[PDB]
């Protein structure tokens, strides 16, 4: 089972579960925050995300007079010591809650076990590189007095705070030369920048039609539906499969599409229902086309791999069967790799099939819209998920024992109008 490790923001480096952590986009800066390990190689570190963004930007700030723009501010978030530990405490809930459920618990799970490819294509096909910001991370292990020393450490998901607009949740690969590890097969450290308390709010749902409006209501999002998305952009990620650039133009606006204007094939994988369906298989076959002659690289790369200059400390046999069983490879007589298309068609599909946001709502009775297709309106301040008499790892909102159980009366604004808040 997955293990969802417990802290308060204040215990003290403890050079394991507690860190000194040098974030990707820092490396070699000499620039460390303080990193709680929530599972085996998943970290959350409750401080803005500020990368490609300047201590302007964080803050356009209006106040008197002002309603929406559909982006929102407030350069307060995440300015306390205590802010930080509820941040810290609520993302634990969430993960509580993803974990509550067998299919939350595998997604976590593939997650963990999602281990990035050990250097990219920059690296030679013999070689086994860990000295890149895909690969690791450095931990300080050097005291608090001064001279710095660091141990470069494995990782897999590192959820920072949001950045300047905080209802734009985002999932986050690394680049160089705009070519994407995360997208060509070995994988690479994904971050995300979340904020909990911010929902998203829709209405594009009761796809039953035969009488005039197929129904409306105002509902808002559960957090851990939110999260376990892009937890699943982070999964495509991790095993390099993450689509890239390929914008979806629909050609009918079909029953449960709210919405028109082009969507990212990435997005419409990761919600699944009948989004992909919106997908010529023209376009849809060649995605996975793609994938396997990604795997054929990684495959020859096994096959070939003979040393790790980065670290002599590596059994690259060891890795090297690690990986086997990563990419679901299978060994012959001669010790050699190669792929099952059996076996390499359930792991596609797993990965972008298994885990989709329409599934994992329909199984976590949560009520999400009936389409990526939707348009966006104001989100809404979820005033404490830290109150049970409000959200629940269980229930979440929809909670039995405040008879908020059925037709997600737990979700509904005009019904649960105590459990959130309409920002400005
Ligand atoms: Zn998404």
Known sequence: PVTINNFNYNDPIDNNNI????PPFARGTGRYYKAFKITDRIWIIPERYTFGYKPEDFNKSSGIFNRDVCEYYDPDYLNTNDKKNIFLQTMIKLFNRIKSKPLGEKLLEMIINGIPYLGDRRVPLEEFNTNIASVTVNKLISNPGEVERKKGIFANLIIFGPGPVLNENETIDIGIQNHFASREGFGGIMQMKFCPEYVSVFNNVQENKGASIFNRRGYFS???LILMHELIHVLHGLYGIKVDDLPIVPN???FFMQ???AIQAEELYTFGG?????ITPSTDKSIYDKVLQNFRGIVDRLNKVLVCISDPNININIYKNKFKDKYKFVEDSEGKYSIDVESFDKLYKSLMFGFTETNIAENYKIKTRASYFSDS???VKIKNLLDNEIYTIEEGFNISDKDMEKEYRGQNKA???QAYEEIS
């Open 252 to 254: 009918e606006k079909k």
């Open 19 to 22: 860190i000194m952590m040098e």
């Open 377 to 379: 309106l104001p989100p």
């Open 222 to 224: 559960d957090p851990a």
């Open 274 to 278: 009948q989004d992909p369906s919106i």
């Open 259 to 261: 919405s028109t204007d």
């Open 415 to 417: 019904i649960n109008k």
